[PDB]
Ligand SMILES: NC(=O)[C@H](CCC(=O)O)NC(=O)[C@H](CCC(=O)O)NC(=O)[C@@H](CC(=O)NO)Cc1cc(-c2ccc(-c3cccc(Cl)c3)cc2)no1
Ligand SMILES: [Ca+2]
Ligand SMILES: [Ca+2]
């Protein structure tokens with residue numbers, strides 16, 4: 001029962017890009033991650049390059065300006081703030097990980113689906129098949145599906 005955006009049009013902006021991947025692949029991973037959630041809700045997401053976005057996607061290292069400092073390679077991979085103005089909604093990814101499009105390193109798409117879930121108001125799930133489960137696991141991203149638990153959670157917040 002976390003906070004929700006009180007609107008169905010939500011903007012995002014990619015503040016900066018990890019050097020681990022090329023720019024087009026970061027854009028693609030993030031766009032696809034948003035699409036996962038838009039597919040089961042009334043929410044629409046538009047990327048903007050200037051202006052005031054609701055959800056700011058950031059790659060940062062260690063102590064990076066909030067009360068959720070990162071811990072170097074491994075451990076916590078990313079974190080996100082629930083809906084709200086300013087820092088609210090923003091999704092932060094630990095640059096000390098090695099972000100990838102694949103099964104090696106840490107898959108950006110999967111991690112982004114999880115974080116965007118928080119950006120929309122979801123908390124963690126106890127279901128090990130849920131993308132909102134607390135621990136990262138790689139799954140073939142081409143056959144990725146939200147679990148029924150994730151769909152339940154997000155539909156309880158929107159629509
Ligand atoms: N322990 C680990 O396996 C890794 C470390 C690996 C390494 O060394 O690099 N670290 C984590 O998993 C950490 C643990 C942090 C802790 O609790 O101490 N967890 C994260 O980094 C989470 C932190 C968080 O909650 N941020 O909001 C981030 C996270 C969660 C996932 C996510 C993605 C897909 C799935 C999944 C699971 C089952 C099925 C499907 Cl389809 C998908 C469910 C979770 N992606 O990013
Ligand atoms: Ca924000
Ligand atoms: Ca880390």
Ligand SMILES: [Ca+2]
Nearest residue numbers: 020095097098
């Ligand atoms: Ca990196």
Ligand SMILES: [Zn+2]
Nearest residue numbers: 064066068092
């Ligand atoms: Zn942060």
Ligand SMILES: [Zn+2]
Nearest residue numbers: 114118124134
């Ligand atoms: Zn989480």
